[PDB]
Coordinates of C-alpha atoms and ligand atoms in Angstrom, one line a residue:
Chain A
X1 CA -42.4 -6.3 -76.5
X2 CA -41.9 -3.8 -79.0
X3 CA -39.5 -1.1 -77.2
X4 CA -37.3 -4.2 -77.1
X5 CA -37.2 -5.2 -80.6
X6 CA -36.0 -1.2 -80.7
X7 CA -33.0 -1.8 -78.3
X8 CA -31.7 -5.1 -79.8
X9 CA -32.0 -2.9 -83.0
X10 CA -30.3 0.3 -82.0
X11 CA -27.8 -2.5 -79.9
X12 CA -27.2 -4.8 -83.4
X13 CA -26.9 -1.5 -85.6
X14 CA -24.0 -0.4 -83.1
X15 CA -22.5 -3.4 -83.2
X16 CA -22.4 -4.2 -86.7
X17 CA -20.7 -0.5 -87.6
X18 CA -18.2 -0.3 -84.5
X19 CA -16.9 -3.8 -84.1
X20 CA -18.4 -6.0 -86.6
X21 CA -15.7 -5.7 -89.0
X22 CA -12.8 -4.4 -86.5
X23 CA -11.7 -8.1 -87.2
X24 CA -10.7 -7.6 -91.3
X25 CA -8.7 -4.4 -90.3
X26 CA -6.0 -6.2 -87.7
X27 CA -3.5 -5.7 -90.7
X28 CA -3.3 -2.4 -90.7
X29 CA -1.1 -3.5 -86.7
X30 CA 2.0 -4.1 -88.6
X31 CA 1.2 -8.3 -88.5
X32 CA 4.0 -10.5 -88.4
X33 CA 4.4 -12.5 -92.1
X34 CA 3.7 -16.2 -90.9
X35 CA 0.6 -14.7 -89.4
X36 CA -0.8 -14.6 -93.2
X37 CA -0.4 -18.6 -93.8
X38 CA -2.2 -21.6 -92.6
X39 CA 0.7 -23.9 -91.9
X40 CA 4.1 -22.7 -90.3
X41 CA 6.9 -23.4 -89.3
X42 CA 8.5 -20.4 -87.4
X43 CA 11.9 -19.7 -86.1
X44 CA 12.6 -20.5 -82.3
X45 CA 14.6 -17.4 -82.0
X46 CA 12.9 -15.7 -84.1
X47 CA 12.4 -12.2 -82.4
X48 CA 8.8 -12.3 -80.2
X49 CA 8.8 -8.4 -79.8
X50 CA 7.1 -8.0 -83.3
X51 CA 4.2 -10.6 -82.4
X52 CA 3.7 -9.4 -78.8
X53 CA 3.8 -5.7 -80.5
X54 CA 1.4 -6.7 -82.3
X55 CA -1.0 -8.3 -80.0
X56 CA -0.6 -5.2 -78.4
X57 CA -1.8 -3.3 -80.8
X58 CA -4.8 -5.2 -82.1
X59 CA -6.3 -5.2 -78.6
X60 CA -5.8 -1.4 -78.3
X61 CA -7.3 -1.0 -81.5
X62 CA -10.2 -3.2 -80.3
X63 CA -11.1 -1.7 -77.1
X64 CA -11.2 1.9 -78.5
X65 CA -13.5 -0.1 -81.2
X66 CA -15.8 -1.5 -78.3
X67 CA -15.6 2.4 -76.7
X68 CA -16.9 3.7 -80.1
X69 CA -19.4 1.3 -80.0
X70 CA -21.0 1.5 -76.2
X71 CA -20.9 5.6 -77.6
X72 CA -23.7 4.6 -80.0
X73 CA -26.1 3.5 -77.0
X74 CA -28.4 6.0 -76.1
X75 CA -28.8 4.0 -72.3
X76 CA -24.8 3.8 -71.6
X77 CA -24.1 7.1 -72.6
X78 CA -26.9 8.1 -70.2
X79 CA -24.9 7.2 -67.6
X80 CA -22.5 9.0 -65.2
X81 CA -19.3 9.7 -66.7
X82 CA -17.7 7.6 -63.8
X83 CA -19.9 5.1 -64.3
X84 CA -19.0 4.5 -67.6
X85 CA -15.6 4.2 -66.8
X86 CA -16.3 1.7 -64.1
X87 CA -18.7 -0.3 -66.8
X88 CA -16.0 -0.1 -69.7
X89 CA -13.2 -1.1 -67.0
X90 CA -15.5 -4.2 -66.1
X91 CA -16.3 -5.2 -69.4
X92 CA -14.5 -4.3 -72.5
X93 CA -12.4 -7.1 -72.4
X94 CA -15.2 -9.4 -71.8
X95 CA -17.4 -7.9 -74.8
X96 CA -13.7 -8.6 -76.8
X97 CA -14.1 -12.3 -76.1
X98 CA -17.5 -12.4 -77.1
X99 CA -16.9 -10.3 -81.0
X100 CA -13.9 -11.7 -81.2
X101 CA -15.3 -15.5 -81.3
X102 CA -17.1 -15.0 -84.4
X103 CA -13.8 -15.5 -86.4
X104 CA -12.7 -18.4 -84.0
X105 CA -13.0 -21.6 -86.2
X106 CA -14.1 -24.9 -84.5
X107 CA -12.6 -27.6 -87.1
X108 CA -9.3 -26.1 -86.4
X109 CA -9.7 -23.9 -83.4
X110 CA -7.9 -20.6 -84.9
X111 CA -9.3 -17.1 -85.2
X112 CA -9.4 -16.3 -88.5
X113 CA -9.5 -12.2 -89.0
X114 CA -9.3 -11.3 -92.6
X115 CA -5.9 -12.3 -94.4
X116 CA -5.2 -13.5 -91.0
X117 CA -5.1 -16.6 -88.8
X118 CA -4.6 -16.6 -85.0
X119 CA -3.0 -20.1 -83.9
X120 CA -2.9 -20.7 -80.3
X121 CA 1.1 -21.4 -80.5
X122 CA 1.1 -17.9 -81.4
X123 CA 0.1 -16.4 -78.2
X124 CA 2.4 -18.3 -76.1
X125 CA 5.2 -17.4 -78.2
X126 CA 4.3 -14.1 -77.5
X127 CA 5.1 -14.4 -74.2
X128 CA 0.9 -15.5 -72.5
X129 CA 0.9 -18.0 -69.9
X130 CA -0.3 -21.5 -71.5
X131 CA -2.8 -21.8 -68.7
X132 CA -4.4 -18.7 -69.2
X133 CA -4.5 -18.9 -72.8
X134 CA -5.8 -22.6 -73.1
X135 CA -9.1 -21.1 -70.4
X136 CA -9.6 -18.8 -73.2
X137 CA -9.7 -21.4 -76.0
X138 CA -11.9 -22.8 -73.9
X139 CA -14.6 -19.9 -73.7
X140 CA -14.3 -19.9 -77.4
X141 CA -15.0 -23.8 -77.8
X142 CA -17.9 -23.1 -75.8
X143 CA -19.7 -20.2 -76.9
X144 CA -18.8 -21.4 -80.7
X145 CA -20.8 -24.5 -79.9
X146 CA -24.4 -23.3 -78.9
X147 CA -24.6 -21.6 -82.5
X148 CA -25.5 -18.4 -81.2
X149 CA -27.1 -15.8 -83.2
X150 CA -26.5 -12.1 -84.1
X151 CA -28.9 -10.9 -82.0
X152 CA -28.0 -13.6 -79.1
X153 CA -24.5 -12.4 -79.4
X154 CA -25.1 -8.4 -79.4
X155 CA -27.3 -9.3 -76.6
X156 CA -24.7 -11.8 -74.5
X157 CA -22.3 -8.4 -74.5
X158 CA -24.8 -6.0 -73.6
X159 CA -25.8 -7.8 -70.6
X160 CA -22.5 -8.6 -69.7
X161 CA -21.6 -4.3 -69.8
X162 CA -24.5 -3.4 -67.9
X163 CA -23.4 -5.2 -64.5
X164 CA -23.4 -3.8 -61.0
X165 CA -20.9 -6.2 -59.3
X166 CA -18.7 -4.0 -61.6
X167 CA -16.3 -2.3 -58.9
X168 CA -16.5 1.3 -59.3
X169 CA -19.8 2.2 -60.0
X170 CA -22.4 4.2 -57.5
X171 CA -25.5 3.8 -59.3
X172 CA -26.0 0.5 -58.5
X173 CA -29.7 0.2 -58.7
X174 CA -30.1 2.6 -61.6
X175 CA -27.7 -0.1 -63.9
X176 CA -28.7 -2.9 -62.4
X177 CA -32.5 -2.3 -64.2
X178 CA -30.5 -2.1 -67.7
X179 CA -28.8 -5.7 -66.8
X180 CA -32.0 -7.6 -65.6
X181 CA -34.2 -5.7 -68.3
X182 CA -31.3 -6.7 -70.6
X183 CA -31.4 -10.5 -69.9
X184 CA -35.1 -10.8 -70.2
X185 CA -34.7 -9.6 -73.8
X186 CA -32.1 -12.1 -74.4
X187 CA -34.4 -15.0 -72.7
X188 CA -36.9 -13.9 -74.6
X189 CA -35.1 -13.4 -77.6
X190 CA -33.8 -17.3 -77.2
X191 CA -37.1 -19.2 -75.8
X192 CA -39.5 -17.4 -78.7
X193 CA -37.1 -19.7 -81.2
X194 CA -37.3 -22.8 -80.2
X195 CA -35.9 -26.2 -80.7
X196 CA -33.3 -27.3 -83.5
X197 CA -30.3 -25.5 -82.0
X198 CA -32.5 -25.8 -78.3
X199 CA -29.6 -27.4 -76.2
X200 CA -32.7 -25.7 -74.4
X201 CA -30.8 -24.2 -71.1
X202 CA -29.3 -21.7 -73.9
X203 CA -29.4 -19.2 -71.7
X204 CA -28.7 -21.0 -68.6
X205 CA -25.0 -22.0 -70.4
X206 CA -24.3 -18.2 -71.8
X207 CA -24.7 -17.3 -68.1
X208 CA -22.2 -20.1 -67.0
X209 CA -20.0 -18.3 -70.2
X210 CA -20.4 -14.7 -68.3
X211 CA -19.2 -15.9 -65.5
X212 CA -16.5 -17.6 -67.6
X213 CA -15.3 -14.2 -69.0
X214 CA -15.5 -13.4 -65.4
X215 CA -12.5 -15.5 -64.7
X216 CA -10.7 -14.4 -67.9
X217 CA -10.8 -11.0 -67.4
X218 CA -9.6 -11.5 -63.5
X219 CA -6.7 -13.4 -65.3
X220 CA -5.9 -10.2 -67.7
X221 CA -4.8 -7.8 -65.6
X222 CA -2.8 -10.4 -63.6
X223 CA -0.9 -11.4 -67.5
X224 CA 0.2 -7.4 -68.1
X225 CA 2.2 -7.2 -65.2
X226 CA 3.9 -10.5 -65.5
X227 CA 4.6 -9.2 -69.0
X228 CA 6.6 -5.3 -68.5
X229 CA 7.0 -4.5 -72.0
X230 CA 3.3 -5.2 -72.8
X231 CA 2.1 -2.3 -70.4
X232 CA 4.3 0.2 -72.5
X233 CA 3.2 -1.2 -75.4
X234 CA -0.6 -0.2 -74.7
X235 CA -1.4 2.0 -72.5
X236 CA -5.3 2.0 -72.3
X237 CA -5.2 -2.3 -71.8
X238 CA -3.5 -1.0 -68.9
X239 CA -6.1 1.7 -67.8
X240 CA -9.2 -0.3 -68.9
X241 CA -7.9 -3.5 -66.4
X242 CA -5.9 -1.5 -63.7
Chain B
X1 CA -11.4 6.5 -58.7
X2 CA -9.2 9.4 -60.1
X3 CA -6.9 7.4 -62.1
X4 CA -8.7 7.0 -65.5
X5 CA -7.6 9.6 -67.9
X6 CA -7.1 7.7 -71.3
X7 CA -10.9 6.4 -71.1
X8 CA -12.1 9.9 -70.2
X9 CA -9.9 11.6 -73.4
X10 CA -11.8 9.0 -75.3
X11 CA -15.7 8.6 -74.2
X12 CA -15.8 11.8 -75.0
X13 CA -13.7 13.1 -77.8
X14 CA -15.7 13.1 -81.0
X15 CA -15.1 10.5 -83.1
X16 CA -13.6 11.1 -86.8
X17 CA -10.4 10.9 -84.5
X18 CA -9.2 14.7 -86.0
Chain C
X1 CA -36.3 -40.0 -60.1
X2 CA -35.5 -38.2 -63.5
X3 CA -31.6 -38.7 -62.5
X4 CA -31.7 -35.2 -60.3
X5 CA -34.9 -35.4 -58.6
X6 CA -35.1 -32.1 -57.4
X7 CA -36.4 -34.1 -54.2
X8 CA -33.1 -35.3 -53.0
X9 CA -31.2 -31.4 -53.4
X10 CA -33.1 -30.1 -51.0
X11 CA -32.3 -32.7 -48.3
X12 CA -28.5 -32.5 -48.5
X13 CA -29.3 -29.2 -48.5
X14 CA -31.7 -29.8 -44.9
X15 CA -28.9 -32.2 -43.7
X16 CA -25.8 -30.2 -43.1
X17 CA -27.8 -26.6 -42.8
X18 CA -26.3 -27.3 -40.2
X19 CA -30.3 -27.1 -38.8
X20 CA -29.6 -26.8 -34.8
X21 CA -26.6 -26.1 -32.6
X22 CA -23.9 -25.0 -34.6
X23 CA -25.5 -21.4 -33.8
X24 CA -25.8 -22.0 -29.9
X25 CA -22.2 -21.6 -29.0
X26 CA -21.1 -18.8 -31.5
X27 CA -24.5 -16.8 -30.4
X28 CA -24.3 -18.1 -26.9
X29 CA -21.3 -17.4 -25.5
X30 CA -17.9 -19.2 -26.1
X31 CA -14.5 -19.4 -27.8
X32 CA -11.7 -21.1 -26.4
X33 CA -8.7 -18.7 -25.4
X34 CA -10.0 -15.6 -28.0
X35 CA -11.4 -14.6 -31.2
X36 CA -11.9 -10.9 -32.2
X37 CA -10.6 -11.1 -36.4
X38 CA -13.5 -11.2 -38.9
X39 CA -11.1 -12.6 -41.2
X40 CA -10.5 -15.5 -39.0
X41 CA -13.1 -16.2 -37.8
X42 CA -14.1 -16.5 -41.1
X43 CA -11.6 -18.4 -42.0
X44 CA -12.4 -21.1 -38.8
X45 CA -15.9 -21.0 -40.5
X46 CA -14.6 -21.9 -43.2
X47 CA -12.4 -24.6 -42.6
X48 CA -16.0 -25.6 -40.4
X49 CA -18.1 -25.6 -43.4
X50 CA -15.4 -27.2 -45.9
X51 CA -16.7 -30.6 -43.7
X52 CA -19.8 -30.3 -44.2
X53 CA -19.5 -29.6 -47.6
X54 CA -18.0 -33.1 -48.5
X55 CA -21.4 -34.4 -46.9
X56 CA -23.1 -32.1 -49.2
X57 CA -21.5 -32.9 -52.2
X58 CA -22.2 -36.6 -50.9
X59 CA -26.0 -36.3 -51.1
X60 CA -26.5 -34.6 -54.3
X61 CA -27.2 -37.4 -56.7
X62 CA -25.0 -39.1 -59.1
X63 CA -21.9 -37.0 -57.5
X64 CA -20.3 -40.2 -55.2
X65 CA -20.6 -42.1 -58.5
X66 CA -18.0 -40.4 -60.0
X67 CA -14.6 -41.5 -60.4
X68 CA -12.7 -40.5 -57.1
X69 CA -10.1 -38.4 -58.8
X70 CA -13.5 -36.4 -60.1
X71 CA -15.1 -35.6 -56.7
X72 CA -11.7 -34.0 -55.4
X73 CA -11.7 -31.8 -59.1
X74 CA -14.8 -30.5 -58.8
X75 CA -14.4 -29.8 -55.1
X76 CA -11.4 -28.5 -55.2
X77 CA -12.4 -26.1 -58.4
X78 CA -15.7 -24.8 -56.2
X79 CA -15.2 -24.9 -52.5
X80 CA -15.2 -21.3 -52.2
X81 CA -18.3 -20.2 -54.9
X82 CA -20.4 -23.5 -53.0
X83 CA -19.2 -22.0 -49.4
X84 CA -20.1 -18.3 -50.3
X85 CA -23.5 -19.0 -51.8
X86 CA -24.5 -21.3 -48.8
X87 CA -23.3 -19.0 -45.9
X88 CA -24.8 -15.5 -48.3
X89 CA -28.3 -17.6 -48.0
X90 CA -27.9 -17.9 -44.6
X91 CA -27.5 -14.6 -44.2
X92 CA -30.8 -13.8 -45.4
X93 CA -32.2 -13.0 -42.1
X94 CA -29.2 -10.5 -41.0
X95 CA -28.9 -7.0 -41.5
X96 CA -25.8 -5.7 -42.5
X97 CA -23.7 -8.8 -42.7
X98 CA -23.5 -12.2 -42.7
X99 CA -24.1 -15.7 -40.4
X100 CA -21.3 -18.0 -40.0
X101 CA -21.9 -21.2 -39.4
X102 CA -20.1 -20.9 -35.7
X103 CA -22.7 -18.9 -34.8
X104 CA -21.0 -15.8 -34.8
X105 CA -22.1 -12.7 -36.8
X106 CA -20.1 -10.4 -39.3
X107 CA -21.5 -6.6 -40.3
X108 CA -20.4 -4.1 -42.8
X109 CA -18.1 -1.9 -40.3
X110 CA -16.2 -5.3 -39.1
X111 CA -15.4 -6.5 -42.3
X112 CA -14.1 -2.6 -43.2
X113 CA -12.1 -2.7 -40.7
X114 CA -10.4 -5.9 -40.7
X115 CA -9.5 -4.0 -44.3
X116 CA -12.1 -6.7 -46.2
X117 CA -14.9 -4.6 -46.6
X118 CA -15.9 -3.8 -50.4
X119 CA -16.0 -7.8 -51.6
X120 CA -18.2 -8.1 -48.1
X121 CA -20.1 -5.9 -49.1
X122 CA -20.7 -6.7 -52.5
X123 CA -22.0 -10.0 -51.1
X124 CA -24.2 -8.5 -49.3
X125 CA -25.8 -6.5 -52.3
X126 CA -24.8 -9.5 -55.2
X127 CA -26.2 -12.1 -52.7
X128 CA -27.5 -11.6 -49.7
X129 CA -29.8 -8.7 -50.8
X130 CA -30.8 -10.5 -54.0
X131 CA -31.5 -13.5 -52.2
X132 CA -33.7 -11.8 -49.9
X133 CA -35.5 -10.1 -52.9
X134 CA -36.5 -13.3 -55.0
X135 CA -36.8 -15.2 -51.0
X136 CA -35.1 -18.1 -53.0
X137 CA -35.8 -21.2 -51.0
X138 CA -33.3 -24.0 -50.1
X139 CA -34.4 -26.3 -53.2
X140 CA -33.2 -23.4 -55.9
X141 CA -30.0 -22.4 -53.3
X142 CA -29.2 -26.2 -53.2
X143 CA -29.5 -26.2 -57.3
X144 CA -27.4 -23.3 -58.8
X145 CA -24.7 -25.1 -55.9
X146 CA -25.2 -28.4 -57.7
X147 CA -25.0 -26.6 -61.0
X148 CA -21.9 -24.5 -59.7
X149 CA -20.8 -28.1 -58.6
X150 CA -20.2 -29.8 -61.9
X151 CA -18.8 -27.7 -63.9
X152 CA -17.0 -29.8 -67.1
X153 CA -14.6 -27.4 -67.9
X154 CA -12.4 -28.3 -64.2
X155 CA -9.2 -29.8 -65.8
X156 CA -7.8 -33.1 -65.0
X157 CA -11.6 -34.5 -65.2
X158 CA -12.1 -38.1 -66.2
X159 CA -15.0 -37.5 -67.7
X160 CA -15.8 -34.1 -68.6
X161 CA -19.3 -35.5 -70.7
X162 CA -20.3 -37.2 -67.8
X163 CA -20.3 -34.0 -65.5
X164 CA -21.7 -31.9 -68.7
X165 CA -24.8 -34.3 -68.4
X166 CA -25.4 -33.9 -65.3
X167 CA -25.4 -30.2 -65.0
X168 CA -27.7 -30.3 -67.8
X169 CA -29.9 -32.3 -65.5
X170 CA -30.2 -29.6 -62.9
X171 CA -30.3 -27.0 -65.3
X172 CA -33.6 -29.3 -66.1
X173 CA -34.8 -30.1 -62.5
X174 CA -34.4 -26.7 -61.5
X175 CA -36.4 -25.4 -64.6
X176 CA -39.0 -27.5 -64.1
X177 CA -39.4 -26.9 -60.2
X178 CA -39.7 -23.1 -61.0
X179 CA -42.5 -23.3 -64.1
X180 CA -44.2 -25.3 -61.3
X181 CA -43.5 -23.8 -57.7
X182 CA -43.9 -20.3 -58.8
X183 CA -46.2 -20.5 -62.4
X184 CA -46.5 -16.5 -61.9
X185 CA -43.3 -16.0 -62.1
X186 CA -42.1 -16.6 -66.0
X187 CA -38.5 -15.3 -65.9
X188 CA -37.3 -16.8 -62.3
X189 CA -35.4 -19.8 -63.8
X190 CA -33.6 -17.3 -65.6
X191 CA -33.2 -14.8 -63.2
X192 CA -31.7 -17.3 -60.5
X193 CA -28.9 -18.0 -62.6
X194 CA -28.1 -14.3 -63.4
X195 CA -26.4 -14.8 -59.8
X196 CA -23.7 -17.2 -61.3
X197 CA -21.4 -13.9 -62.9
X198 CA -21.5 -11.9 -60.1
X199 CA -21.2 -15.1 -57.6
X200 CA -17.5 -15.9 -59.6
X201 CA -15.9 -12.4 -59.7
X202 CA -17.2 -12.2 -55.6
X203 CA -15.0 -16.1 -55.4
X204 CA -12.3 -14.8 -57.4
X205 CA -11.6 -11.7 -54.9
X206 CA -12.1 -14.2 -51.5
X207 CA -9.3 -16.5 -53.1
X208 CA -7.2 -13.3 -53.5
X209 CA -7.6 -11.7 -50.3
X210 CA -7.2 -15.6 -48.6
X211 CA -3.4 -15.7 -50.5
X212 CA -2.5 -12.9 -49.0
X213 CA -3.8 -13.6 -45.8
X214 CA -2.1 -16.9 -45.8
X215 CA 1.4 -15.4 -47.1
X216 CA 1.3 -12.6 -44.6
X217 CA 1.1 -15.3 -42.0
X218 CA -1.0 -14.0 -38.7
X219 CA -4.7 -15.0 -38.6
X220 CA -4.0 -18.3 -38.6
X221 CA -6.3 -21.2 -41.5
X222 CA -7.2 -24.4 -40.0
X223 CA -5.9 -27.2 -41.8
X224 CA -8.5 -28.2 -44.9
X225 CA -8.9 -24.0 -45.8
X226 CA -4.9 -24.7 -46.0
X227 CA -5.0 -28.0 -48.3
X228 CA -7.8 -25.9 -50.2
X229 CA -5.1 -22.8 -50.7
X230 CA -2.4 -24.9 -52.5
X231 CA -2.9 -23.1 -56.0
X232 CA -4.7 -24.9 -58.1
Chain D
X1 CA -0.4 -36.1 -55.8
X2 CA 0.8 -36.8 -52.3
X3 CA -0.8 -33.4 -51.6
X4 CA -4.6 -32.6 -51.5
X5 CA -5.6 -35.6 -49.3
X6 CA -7.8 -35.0 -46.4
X7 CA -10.5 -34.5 -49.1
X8 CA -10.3 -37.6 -50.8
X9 CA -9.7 -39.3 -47.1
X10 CA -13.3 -37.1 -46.5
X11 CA -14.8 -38.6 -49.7
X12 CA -14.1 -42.4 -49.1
X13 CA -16.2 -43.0 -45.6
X14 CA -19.4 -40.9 -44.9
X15 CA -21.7 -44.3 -45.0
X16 CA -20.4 -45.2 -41.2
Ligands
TCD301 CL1 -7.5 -12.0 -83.1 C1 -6.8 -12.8 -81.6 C2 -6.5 -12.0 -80.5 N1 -5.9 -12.6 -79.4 C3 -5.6 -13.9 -79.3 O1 -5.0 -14.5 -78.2 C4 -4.9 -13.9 -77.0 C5 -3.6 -13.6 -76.6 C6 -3.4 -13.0 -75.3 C7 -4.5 -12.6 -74.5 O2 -4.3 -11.9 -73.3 C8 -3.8 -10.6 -73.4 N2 -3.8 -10.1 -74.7 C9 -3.4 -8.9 -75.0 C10 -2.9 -8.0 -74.0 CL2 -2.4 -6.4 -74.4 C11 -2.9 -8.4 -72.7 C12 -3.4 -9.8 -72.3 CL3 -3.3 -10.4 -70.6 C13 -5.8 -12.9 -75.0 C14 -6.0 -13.5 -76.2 C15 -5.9 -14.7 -80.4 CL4 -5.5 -16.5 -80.4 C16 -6.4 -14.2 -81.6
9CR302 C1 -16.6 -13.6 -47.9 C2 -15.2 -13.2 -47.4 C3 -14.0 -14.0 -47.3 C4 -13.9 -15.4 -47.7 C5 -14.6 -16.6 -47.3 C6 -14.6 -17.9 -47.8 C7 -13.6 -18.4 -49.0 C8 -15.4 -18.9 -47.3 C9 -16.3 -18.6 -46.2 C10 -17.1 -19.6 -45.7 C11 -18.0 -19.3 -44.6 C12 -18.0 -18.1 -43.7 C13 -18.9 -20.4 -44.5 C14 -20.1 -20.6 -43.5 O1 -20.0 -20.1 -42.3 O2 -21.1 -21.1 -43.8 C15 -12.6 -13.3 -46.7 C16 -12.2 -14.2 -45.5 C17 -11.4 -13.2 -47.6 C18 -12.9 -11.9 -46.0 C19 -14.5 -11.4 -45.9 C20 -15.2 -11.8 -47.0

């Protein structure tokens, strides 16, 4: 209606000062050189501790982002202080993967932050599990091709924050409202622009990708620990999944 | 949940980071 | 007819309810030598159910005309979000807990208890209760399965295009069905699928808790739940 | 595979 075009508004304007352009600042996390080009090669001993020190410290970097930016909504900050740690510890992660995929490139399937360009060969250097990283490539394949919108995306996180099955939470009933009033916005949003991008079931396939980040996220927490070092390294990864 | 400190020291916090 | 004639879900769905029986020796008396453990018998449930579910899977349309190797993917990738969702609609009709398809009934304190409570329970507030809510009927149960079902993204796949297609279809059938069925009702489509998320964290928890059931040895997993349990 | 069987055994028979 119109209270809606309001929260999509006070949602987008969040957004777009909080995480929007967390991306062009990732070289201010001491980046690794290669990380600047297009086309390698790299050195097999080359030390990984730099690179996974980095990744390290982009993600902390985002998820005090994403903090800054659930801050700015009137409706999450409304909430009990323990809820929004059980909400934030359900989701920020899953809201990464869903900013972060603005910079992922289709033609060549790299995240492209600023000066920077994320390869996939990166990450497992670093030390990630190959499975685990090729599900995320995955998500971002995916959510890269249904062509999704400002709006649609600011709206794909918000509905993905505001959910009860989060462990943790108490006021179940009192956040569930925000999620289902939240999707029908996002419906809404999508069926009242129509065709030419349809694929139609647009919102039947972001709510396969929720449940997509789902899985990714289970798999985070499971990668720190298989990792030591990494914990050190960032602290509040380790709160925000543990 | 009692665990959750850093997320507490930063919901809150005002931001400006000083 | 349009290639997932939302007329043939809803009878593999009404041919392995199971329908009659299955619930007169569970609720009736029975149980050869003992069973106390929520968790197994559960897990016997389970292993029960997994046969059906072949059947099932059998019946939903274009499924058996998939390459071999792609039936065992795909069943093998959602036994366990296909087997929750069926035995949470079952449920419906409980209070606090859940129907096994033995017969035999599972409530809140059980499952506590047997030290599982907390992803029971948030089955029977993420499904169960919702479920009841909406009262979604066996044609819409029997579709998000089917859409749970093929899912493209299953590695190993022969034809990931083929199964994208055909989860398109049901996205489709399902649609349709609702707009019709319930005209008064604009967002239902929509809010039947809201279920997916929450019905994927609640399968990736039961996996976790099954591992550790299996490594700890004790309440013993038929065969089947055991060639299911092989880390995929 | 020579593991994962009794499904595909399942899978090639429910006519009967
Ligand atoms: Cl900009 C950009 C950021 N990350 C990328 O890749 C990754 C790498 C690891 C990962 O999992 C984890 N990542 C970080 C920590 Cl601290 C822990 C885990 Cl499990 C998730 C994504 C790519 Cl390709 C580009
Ligand atoms: C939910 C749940 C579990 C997992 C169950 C699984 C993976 C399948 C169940 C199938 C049934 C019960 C089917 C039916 O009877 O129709 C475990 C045991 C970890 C403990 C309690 C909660």
């Amino acid at each position: 209606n119109q209270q809606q075009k309001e929260l999509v508004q006070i949602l987008l304007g969040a957004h777009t000062r909080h995480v929007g352009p967390l991306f062009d600042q990732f070289v201010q996390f001491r980046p690794p050189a290669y990380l600047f080009m297009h086309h390698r090669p790299f050195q097999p001993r080359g030390p990984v501790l730099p690179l996974l020190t980095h990744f390290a410290d982009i993600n902390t970097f985002m998820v005090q982002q994403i903090i800054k930016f659930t801050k700015d909504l009137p409706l999450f900050r409304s909430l009990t202080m323990e809820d929004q740690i059980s909400l934030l510890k359900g989701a920020a992660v899953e809201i990464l993967h869903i900013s972060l995929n603005t910079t992922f490139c289709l033609q060549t399937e790299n995240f492209f932050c600023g000066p920077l360009c994320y390869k996939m060969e990166d990450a497992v250097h670093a030390g990630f599990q190959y499975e685990f990283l090729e599900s995320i490539l995955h998500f971002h394949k995916n959510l890269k091709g249904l062509h999704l919108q400002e709006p649609e995306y600011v709206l794909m996180a918000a509905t993905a924050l505001f959910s009860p099955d989060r462990p943790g939470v108490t006021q179940r009933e009192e956040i569930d409202q925000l999620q289902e009033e939240m999707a029908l916005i996002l419906n809404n949003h999508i069926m009242e622009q129509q065709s030419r991008l349809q694929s139609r079931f647009l919102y039947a396939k972001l709510m396969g990708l929720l449940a997509d980040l789902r899985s990714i996220n289970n798999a985070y927490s499971y990668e720190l620990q298989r990792l030591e070092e990494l914990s050190a390294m960032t602290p509040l990864l380790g709160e925000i999944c543990s | 949940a009692k665990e959750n400190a850093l997320l507490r020291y930063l919901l809150d916090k005002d931001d400006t980071k000083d | 007819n349009e290639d997932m004639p939302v007329e043939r879900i809803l009878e593999a769905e009404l041919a392995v309810e199971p329908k009659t029986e299955t619930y007169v020796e569970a609720n009736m008396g029975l149980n050869p030598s003992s069973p106390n453990d929520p968790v197994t018998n559960i897990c016997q449930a389970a292993d029960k159910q997994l046969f059906t579910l072949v059947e099932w899977a059998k019946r939903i349309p274009h499924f058996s005309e998939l390459p071999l190797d792609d039936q065992v993917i795909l069943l093998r990738a959602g036994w366990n979000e296909l087997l929750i969702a069926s035995f949470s609609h079952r449920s419906i009709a409980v209070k606090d807990g859940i129907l096994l398809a033995t017969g035999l009934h599972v409530h809140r304190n059980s499952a506590h208890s047997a030290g599982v409570g907390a992803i029971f329970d948030r089955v029977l507030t993420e499904l169960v209760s919702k479920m009841r809510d909406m009262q979604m009927d066996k044609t819409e149960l029997g579709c998000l399965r089917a859409i749970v079902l093929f899912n493209p993204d299953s590695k190993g796949l022969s034809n990931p295009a083929e199964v994208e297609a055909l989860r398109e279809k049901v996205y489709a059938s399902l649609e349709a069905y609702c707009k019709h069925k319930y005209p008064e009702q604009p967002g239902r489509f929509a809010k039947l699928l809201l279920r997916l998320p929450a019905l994927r964290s609640i399968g990736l928890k039961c996996l976790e808790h099954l591992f550790f059931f299996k490594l700890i040895g004790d309440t013993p997993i038929d065969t089947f739940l055991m060639e299911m349990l092989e880390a995929p």
